[PDB]
A paper describes a structure:
S.c [name] is a multi-subunit complex consisting of 15 subunits that are divided into three different modules. The catalytic module with the [name] (ATPase) RecA lobes and insert, Arp5, Ies6, Ies2, Rvb1 and Rvb2, constitutes the core unit of [name] (C-module). [name] slides nucleosomes with 40 bp of flanking DNA ~100-fold slower than nucleosomes with 80 bp of flanking DNA, displaying a switch like response to flanking DNA length.
However, deletion of this module has been shown to increase remodeling of X.l 0/40 nucleosomes by ~100-fold, a result we also observed with S.c 0/40 nucleosomes. Through further cryo-EM processing, we find that the majority of particles show undefined density for the Arp8 module similar to the [name] bound to S.c 0/80 nucleosome data set in the ADP/BeFx state. Additionally, we identified a small subset of particles showing the Arp8 module on the flanking DNA (~5 %) and another small subset of particles showing the Arp8 module rotated away from the flanking DNA (~4 %) (center and right panel respectively). Thus, deleting the Nhp10 module substantially decreased the proportion of [name] molecules in the inhibited state. These data suggested that without the Nhp10 module, the Arp8 module is released from the inactive conformation and adopts more than one conformation. Since deleting both modules had a comparable effect as deleting either module, we concluded that the Nhp10 and Arp8 modules cooperate to sequester the HSA from flanking DNA on 0/40 nucleosomes.
Residue numbers in the entry:
A (entry chain D), I (entry chain H): 36 to 128
B (entry chain E), H (entry chain A): 38 to 134
C (entry chain C): 16 to 121
D (entry chain F): 25 to 103
E (entry chain Q): 707 to 901, 919 to 971, 1003 to 1022, 1289 to 1346, 1348 to 1446
F (entry chain Z): 256 to 277
G (entry chain B): 23 to 103
J (entry chain G): 13 to 120
DNA sequence: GAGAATCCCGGTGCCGAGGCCGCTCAATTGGTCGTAGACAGCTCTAGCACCGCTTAAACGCACGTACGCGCTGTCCCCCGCGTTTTAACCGCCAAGGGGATTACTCCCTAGTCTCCAGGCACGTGTCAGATATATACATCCTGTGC
DNA sequence: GCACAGGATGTATATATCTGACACGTGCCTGGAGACTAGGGAGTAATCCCCTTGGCGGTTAAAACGCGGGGGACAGCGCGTACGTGCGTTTAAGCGGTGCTAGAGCTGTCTACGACCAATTGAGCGGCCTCGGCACCGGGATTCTC
């Protein structure tokens, strides 16, 4: 028994495109993509919190990390929507 | 009694290959090469079929990129014929020694 | 209730928090950090599969094959810049021809 | 002959993927050498991962692991 | 308090004329109190307390600090010596940026050496001074020195020179001192060479200098007598004289005369053969017996570091209290001279020339031996004047040994040739 | 003010220690 | 605006090239190399400054910049101490 | 007078520069350049001096590498004179844009 | 209060070439070099041991990682030194 | 009971306790065996020893005494194993390698 | 102007891509606490601005000579087309061998108190460059007569 | 027009000083070593089942091989040009000096965010199932080409 992101990415796909099918090798391509990006963010945030002598991971360190490895016109939109999500989660306590 | 212009068929099969995405090297000889280069490190290594395809896709990606940059290096030198000095120029310029 | 629902996201904040727990990065992990990671990962997933759907519509196909993924990842120079050292299985190569390689004139 | 298992039309097909018009006839043996030294490093890195796991068959996992180590990572075969 | 009042009045008169001064007097009559009286009378006349420079060798730097501490404690004394951080602390401590005369600012007295003039000439290119004093100007006479370049370039606009012997007679240093007094009028050495030679040059230099001698005051100083000792070579000192010329510059031709062990030490090394293989050292011991029998203060001068490091082996046998000075630290030059002029149980001193033969108060000794002090009579005159100062309470006997029939005879004749030129002029 | 006075006193003490003992 | 990018003087590019060992240098290379200098500078200094205000400091020390060089695989020694 | 061959003195100063250690661009124009390139991301930004030295020696390392393989790209291209297309080719083969 | 490796690299320099000084810039070069090598070898051994779902760092995975990074001749010299050192340490009798 | 550290018990000069401490809160893993710090200590000792040997004979070739970074650059970049190990690094005050192309020489 | 070579369209499955049911661990909820981060305060090191003089170096300008580049004849070695044979692909069989799974122990490494000495931080003793100086001795430049 | 004597000059080689840049001896403090506890992770071992490598055999596109020829690399030669060379004229880094000031960093202190433990429930993964998107085979329109 193993975990993946099958139904979740399929729900995103059907949410924006209710007619396009997905191949499982293409799905494995994008699974390797998403956990690769997750690994890069997590490792960069771990290094960044290690430089500042802070033993905790918080939203500010991963905020700086996604600010810095993500290039222009994709970083700022991601930062905006993630701040929107964390504010609507913190307000919905 | 016909003969095509040299350059007419070659461009059209470059287009036919570039629209395509299939495999170029036959699978079984590359299987032979990876088994004979594997065995000198430890004997009797079984091989999953998926690892073989991983080696395959890696080497077509690397050789396609190498030929693309070598063709750019050759066309910088006002030539349409590549040469082994252009291969060594590409290997000099990418920095992989 | 799901914590992804109370943030309004479709990716598992609990599962990615659990993966961050044994991910061995620091001793203590803030609560909003998996929420922010969930949001940004679903955003990047959203534009990648959205451009994949655009490429599927551009070539009359209702199925996503890795040729569509390669054509969608290498046309955008930004995602080409982020995916510069990454290759795609059965992806293919964008047909790009140097202008002097074309034969004849006019 | 087992070194030369790959053939001249295969290098031809890879060149036409690369968009190459004219190819000199002395490219092929050094291209075979470049291929033989390129996959040598990844075989060497994959078999060390294989033997450290106390297993004597390789998989796709440790070879794409080695490719991710050496900077030319691959998607779609796990990892 | 003495006849130096008319001298400082003459210097103030030529100051009012507007030219720079020359003193051609031997050190020992107390020119330091003359200089501080000049500065005191200038502060009384037109009220300057600020920018003053004293250029002084490191042996007499703390000495001059000592007399200005004891005599005129009104001024604020600032030493300028040491390592780089303390030097920066001092350069900060005269922040200044307020020219002409200032009253409440502690930069009254600057004391330094020739080298820290030279090495901080970039640091001292600024800060237009008013009155510099350059004491013992024997070391400025060369026109090719870097100290000469950075001391000409100073725009203090007063170049009073203090020296013991300006009479080195090098045919160019007269033009050098004339050029340092007034740089506009004196630049062309060839015109001075072209312009009976002994008589005519007397009236050229006449009004600038003052004529003083030590035989004007009462002579209780000890009226020093030059008793000389001539000796032969030993057989070890004989054989070296032909094995030097068997292989055939003058520097190794000098140290062969002093001791045969200066090239090969006796090894397995008896001291009694070591002392008697040099007839120069042999005659020291017979003199040393009668001076210890009198119980008398003995001063020894030296020229080279090799001969500098052999008498303390010889002094072990007599177990004599002895302190050598040379390379030695300046703070050790403070207390050891202070130990000399206080302790009476001390008898023996090994000295070099350019440190101890300049301006150190040595009035409690009279018996001074010159081992090889024959390189320059001007330094020898300064070395003799270092002991023969005001305050010596008895007669001064100056023993000066020499070895006969050697290269020293030719070197003493070249010294005597430089002797007889300079005392006439 | 107090730091400037302390620095001036330290400079005077350094000049006294180097000037009277060296 | 000001002579900043051309403040890097045209014999200095030539001297930096002659460290590498070139012989003949064309005249039009200088502004292109100036562009190469400036385009290297902004995509190193954006990482340096993001490290800078992440530490709640508005001066740039010598440590966050050497990790900024460490980011893209162009690491530096000696200043990391 | 007597002149030398154009190139023999060039090799003399080539080995003089390669025997050198120090930095060859003045500190004030580079300081003003990094201060005027640092303002757009964030204003009033002070700088450590050794940080400026880090930017310095990093960018001479990058420029000597770029000029060296640009020289090799030119010497592949049957020339000694170096043009714009050498820079474009070398920046293509390094991969950055 | 600072941390460095300066005394140890000083004394391993002194025992093989006693007539040799060291510059402080070179001293920082060595400190940054040994920090880089230690960090690289530790993050490699860490992620490979985590890759084989192994929770423990031992000498076997780090000598595997030495066989990964270091070039083979100095790698085999290094693992020879490591084996002799660990057999000396394990024989604590 | 009075015993010394584990470095000389392993016969090593680099501090095994210090690198062990760096291994604990370096968050590489939560479980660390005993042989890993002594093995890492030995490996770093060997690398430092060979780097210092190349720096030493680089200095003796230039007949100096203090290790200038020129000595370190000529020790590192003139060895191909260190070229493979230190390919992407830039060294402070190191300069460039003395080399010239043969076509650049005046071959006449 | 014909013709091999392209795209597009009609029929054939078919096998491979989405729902459906079960439920099993894994996401979610609530109380404790203590320790790591946030914020105020102080300091003092150090970074910026500016004054003023300096001079190696940078810019302008005139020359010119080796090299980049345009052209032009020379092979000659790659490229397109028959032809075969030959080795890869495909379908299937097996078997056994090696990864996957689970249980059970034990030992080894995590957590805590003590302590004392290993490793600094900051002082002082101890050698290489630099300036200066006589002085004979050999060397160079210069004025002079046959 | 050439040989001979007088004056200037390097200069060497040490000392003497004499600063400038280094190896070595004490306080201290904090962190590694040792002793004790414990608990859960790894080692070991039996078993299972899945897949992986040979092993036939047919068959079938693909490479090996050779021929004709033709277009591109290549040697060389002019020419003109474009940057190397050198020197006059600013000039603007640079040094260093100083003055100010401001924020990096250390300490204290609170408090509040999440690790951890006990409990739960639910939804995500897997076997099983259904049906349709499209690769493939055959026929027709179309396109640069020689």
């Amino acid at each position: 028994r193993k975990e993946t992101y099958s139904s979740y990415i399929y729900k995103v796909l059907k949410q924006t495109h209710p007619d396009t099918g997905i191949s499982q090798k293409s799905m494995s391509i994008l699974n390797s993509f998403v956990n690769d990006i997750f690994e890069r963010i997590a490792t960069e945030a771990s290094k960044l919190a290690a430089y500042n002598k802070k033993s905790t991971i918080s939203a500010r360190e991963i905020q700086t990390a996604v600010r810095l490895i993500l290039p222009g016109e994709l970083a700022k939109h991601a930062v905006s929507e993630g701040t929107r999500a964390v504010t609507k989660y913190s307000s919905s306590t | 009694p016909h003969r095509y212009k040299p350059g007419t068929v070659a461009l059209r099969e470059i287009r036919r290959f570039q629209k395509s995405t299939e495999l170029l090297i036959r699978k079984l000889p590359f299987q032979r090469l990876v088994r004979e280069i594997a065995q000198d490190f430890k004997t009797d290594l079984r091989f999953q079929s998926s690892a073989i395809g991983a080696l395959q896709e890696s080497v077509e990606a690397y050789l396609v990129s190498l030929f693309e940059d070598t063709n750019l290096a050759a066309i910088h030198a006002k030539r349409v014929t590549i040469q082994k000095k252009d291969i060594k120029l590409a290997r000099r310029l990418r920095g992989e020694r | 209730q799901s914590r992804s629902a109370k943030a309004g996201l479709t990716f598992p904040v609990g599962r990615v928090h659990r993966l961050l727990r044994r991910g061995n990065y620091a001793q203590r992990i803030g609560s909003g950090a998996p929420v922010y990671l969930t949001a940004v990962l679903e955003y990047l997933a959203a534009e990648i599969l959205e451009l994949a759907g655009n490429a599927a519509r551009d070539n009359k196909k209702t199925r996503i094959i890795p040729r569509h993924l390669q054509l969608a990842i290498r046309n955008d120079d930004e995602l080409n810049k982020l995916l510069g050292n990454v290759t795609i299985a059965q992806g293919g190569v964008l047909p790009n021809i140097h202008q002097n390689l074309l034969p004849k004139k006019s | 002959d087992n070194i030369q298992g790959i053939t001249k039309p295969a290098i031809r097909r890879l060149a036409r993927r690369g968009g190459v018009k004219r190819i000199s006839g002395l490219i092929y043996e050094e291209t075979r050498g470049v291929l033989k030294v390129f996959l040598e490093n990844v075989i060497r890195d994959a078999v060390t991962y294989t033997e450290h796991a106390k297993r004597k068959t390789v998989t796709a996992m440790d070879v794409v692991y080695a490719l991710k180590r050496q900077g030319r990572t691959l998607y779609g075969f796990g990892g | 308090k003495e006849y130096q009042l008319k001298g400082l009045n003459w210097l103030a008169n030529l100051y009012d004329q507007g030219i720079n001064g020359i003193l051609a007097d031997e050190m020992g009559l107390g020119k330091t109190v003359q200089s501080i009286s000049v500065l005191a009378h200038l502060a009384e006349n037109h009220n300057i307390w600020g920018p003053f420079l004293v250029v002084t060798p490191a042996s007499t730097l703390h000495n001059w600090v000592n007399e200005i501490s004891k005599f005129l404690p009104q001024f604020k004394i600032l030493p300028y010596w040491g390592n780089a951080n303390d030097r920066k602390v001092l350069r900060k401590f005269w922040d200044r940026k307020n020219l002409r005369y200032n009253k409440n600012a502690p930069f009254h007295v600057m004391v330094t050496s020739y080298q820290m003039v030279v090495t901080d000439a970039n640091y001292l290119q600024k800060m237009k001074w008013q009155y510099m004093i350059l004491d013992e100007a024997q070391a400025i006479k060369s026109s090719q020195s870097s100290r000469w370049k950075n001391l000409l370039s100073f725009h203090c606009r007063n170049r009073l020179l203090l020296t013991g012997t300006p009479i080195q007679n090098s045919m160019q240093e007269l033009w050098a001192l004339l050029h340092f007094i007034m740089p506009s009028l004196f630049d062309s050495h060839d015109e001075f060479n072209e312009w009976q030679q002994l008589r005519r040059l007397h009236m050229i230099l006449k009004p600038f200098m003052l004529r003083r001698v030590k035989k004007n005051v009462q002579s209780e100083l000890g009226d020093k007598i030059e008793i000389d000792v001539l000796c032969d070579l030993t057989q070890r000192q004989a054989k070296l004289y032909q094995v030097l010329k068997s292989q055939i510059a003058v520097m190794q031709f000098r140290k062969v005369c002093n001791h045969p062990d200066l090239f090969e030490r006796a090894d397995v090394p008896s001291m009694d053969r070591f002392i008697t293989e040099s007839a120069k050292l042999r005659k020291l011991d017979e003199l040393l017996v009668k001076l210890k029998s009198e119980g008398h203060r003995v001063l020894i001068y030296f020229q080279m570091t090799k001969m500098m490091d052999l008498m303390e082996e010889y002094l072990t046998y007599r177990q004599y209290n002895h302190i050598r000075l040379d390379s030695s630290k300046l703070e050790d030059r403070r207390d050891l001279v202070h130990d000399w002029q206080t302790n009476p149980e001390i008898f023996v001193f090994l000295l070099s020339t350019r440190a101890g033969g300049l301006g150190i108060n040595l009035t409690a000794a009279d018996t001074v031996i010159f081992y090889d002090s024959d390189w320059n009579p001007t330094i020898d005159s300064q070395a003799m004047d270092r002991a023969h100062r005001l305050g010596q309470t008895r007669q001064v006997t100056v023993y000066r040994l020499l070895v006969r029939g050697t290269i020293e005879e030719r070197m003493r004749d070249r010294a005597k040739q430089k002797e007889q030129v300079q005392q006439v002029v | 003010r107090l730091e400037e006075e302390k620095q001036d006193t330290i400079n005077k003490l350094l000049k006294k220690r180097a000037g009277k003992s060296r």
